[PDB]
Write an enzyme that holds these catalytic residues in place. Structure first.
Site, mmCIF file in Angstrom:
data_model
loop_
_atom_site.group_PDB
_atom_site.id
_atom_site.type_symbol
_atom_site.label_atom_id
_atom_site.label_comp_id
_atom_site.label_asym_id
_atom_site.label_seq_id
_atom_site.Cartn_x
_atom_site.Cartn_y
_atom_site.Cartn_z
ATOM 1 N N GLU A 168 0.750 -1.123 0.002
ATOM 2 C CA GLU A 168 0.098 0.061 -0.150
ATOM 3 C C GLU A 168 0.971 1.360 0.024
ATOM 4 O OE1 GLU A 168 -2.823 -0.252 -0.725
ATOM 5 O OE2 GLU A 168 -3.545 -2.231 -0.141
ATOM 6 N N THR A 246 29.001 -4.886 3.924
ATOM 7 C CA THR A 246 27.647 -5.634 4.421
ATOM 8 C C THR A 246 27.592 -7.024 4.311
ATOM 9 O OG1 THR A 246 26.529 -3.609 4.061
ATOM 10 C CG2 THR A 246 25.338 -5.427 4.789
HETATM 11 CA CA LIG Z 1 27.739 -2.400 1.509
#
Ligand SMILES: [Ca+2]
Ligand SMILES: [Ca+2]
Ligand SMILES: [Ca+2]
Ligand SMILES: [Ca+2]
Ligand SMILES: [Ca+2]
Ligand SMILES: [Ca+2]
Ligand SMILES: [Ca+2]
Length: 455
Positions: A168, A246
């Site tokens: 939504e 990461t």
């Molecule tokens: Ca990264």
């Protein structure tokens, strides 16, 4: 004629190709083509204070707006803390990919727009709905909650209650549904399933993906591959998100419930967006046969599921770690660190100097081009186990074999296998072009024998 190992790599690397062909009688659209499709209404928020980012504010309604009763929605109620908490996580997942910020607070003067969230109880209102940014009710989204429809009461990572919020909100940002009782038969393109876009009404089973089995429900919590491209086309990509090294999956450092796994039974469904750094897809905790592809825009089969994990266009992931199963690992053009894990793995480094670890089991290091491992940028197999692991070169030699000698003679196909039993370092040199010098180099930690090479 290449080996069976190479065919499996090539086959999987092409298994999810998109564009310029028919799938199920429907045209296959590339990511770019879908991004135009999802933003065909032409509606979106505008940057009023000029600063290259859409600054939206949002309010969890406390009281019904003026003229609420006439909407036919029945009893009005506000978001519970659970819904508010989940709403923030969904909003966050959008802010992560596009240049849009969301701040809880009343409508201000310097905002580009304002959003509201609230609940209604009259089923005739539908399960939930939002409005496009170019309507009078822009920024509003509503959620049904009553005795007969309980999914929006307990939204959580992986369930439809959470995807609804994400879905939504996408709609309030300007994304349309993939097409205009209807079924998948009525879709315009083939990839119009929940495996490519959270905006789709059709399940991944229409496109062959396998996420779960009857009785259980598994839904992507954040924007998928096509969603990400459609929203960045609208507001520009957010390159500041996770721009440092990461890790996604097991031992994750992404700090996002949907990129995190802590158990072998976890059902992951996500599309990676990353700003830069040296990154890893850690799928070590799984025991199922996986197939990981580090190619931008490609899909992978993770933790017993198929086509459930992908990498967004314009993103480069550097490393991948397999699990206990017999896996396939495919790198990209960057220097990749690929770890197979237990089981019999097939690893394809690709271009660039790659660090490859086969782990235990009988592993196969496949090479598809001479440019995959040259003397300048040579691969390194940190744990080669002679008599068990193999170095497959069949895609190059096409099974014509090699001529193992002690010194290059000038004839194409000459190969030299060395070893320094002190550093435990071995190497394979080959002269494919027959220019009298090596044009392919593969070094290893562990003795390599001539019978460990498949050519
Ligand atoms: Ca990264
Ligand atoms: Ca602005
Ligand atoms: Ca990177
Ligand atoms: Ca493995
Ligand atoms: Ca292995
Ligand atoms: Ca590579
Ligand atoms: Ca390589």
């Amino acid at each position: 004629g290449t080996s069976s190992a190479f065919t499996q790599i090539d086959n999987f690397s092409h298994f999810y190709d998109r564009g310029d062909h028919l799938v199920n009688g429907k045209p296959s659209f590339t990511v770019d083509q879908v991004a135009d499709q999802l933003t065909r209404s032409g509606a979106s928020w505008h940057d009023l204070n000029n600063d290259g980012v859409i600054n939206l504010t949002y309010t969890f309604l406390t009281a019904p707006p003026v003229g609420y009763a006439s909407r036919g929605l029945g009893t009005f109620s506000q978001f519970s803390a659970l819904q508010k908490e989940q709403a923030k996580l969904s909003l966050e997942s959008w802010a992560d990919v596009a240049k849009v910020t969301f701040t809880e607070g009343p409508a201000a003067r310097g905002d580009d727009g304002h959003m509201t969230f609230a609940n209604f109880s009259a089923s005739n209102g539908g399960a939930a709905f939002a409005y496009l940014p170019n309507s009078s009710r822009k920024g509003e989204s509503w959620y049904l909650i009553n005795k007969d429809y309980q999914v929006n009461k307990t939204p959580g990572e992986g369930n439809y209650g959470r995807q609804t919020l994400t879905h939504e909100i996408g709609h309030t940002l300007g994304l349309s549904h993939p097409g205009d009782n209807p079924t998948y038969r009525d879709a315009v393109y083939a990839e119009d399933t929940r495996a490519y876009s959270v905006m789709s009404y059709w399940s991944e089973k229409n496109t062959g993906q396998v996420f779960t089995k009857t009785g259980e429900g598994a839904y992507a919590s954040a924007p998928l591959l096509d969603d990400i491209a459609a929203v960045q086309k609208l507001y520009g990509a957010n390159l500041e998100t996770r721009a440092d090294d990461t890790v996604y999956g097991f031992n994750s450092t992404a700090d996002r419930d949907f990129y995190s796994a802590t158990s072998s039974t976890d059902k992951l469904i996500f599309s990676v967006w990353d700003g830069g750094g040296n990154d890893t897809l850690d799928f070590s905790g799984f025991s199922q046969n996986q197939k990981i592809n580090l190619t931008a825009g490609s899909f992978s089969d993770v933790g017993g599921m198929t086509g459930n994990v992908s990498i967004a266009q314009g993103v480069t992931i550097e490393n991948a770690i397999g699990g206990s199963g017999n896996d396939l690992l495919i790198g990209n053009d960057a220097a990749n660190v690929l770890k197979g894990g237990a089981g019999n793995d097939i690893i394809y480094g690709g271009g660039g100097a790659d660090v490859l670890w086969g782990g235990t089991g009988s592993d196969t290091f496949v090479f598809g081009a001479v440019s995959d491992s040259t003397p300048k940028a040579a691969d390194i197999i940190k744990d080669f186990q002679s008599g068990f692991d193999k170095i497959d070169l069949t895609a190059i030699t096409k099974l014509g074999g090699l001529n193992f000698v002690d010194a290059f003679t000038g004839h194409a196909g000459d190969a030299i296998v060395s070893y320094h039993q002190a550093s435990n370092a071995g190497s394979l040199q080959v002269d494919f072009s027959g220019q009298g010098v090596a044009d392919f180099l593969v070094t290893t930690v562990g003795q390599v024998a001539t019978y460990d090479i498949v050519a």
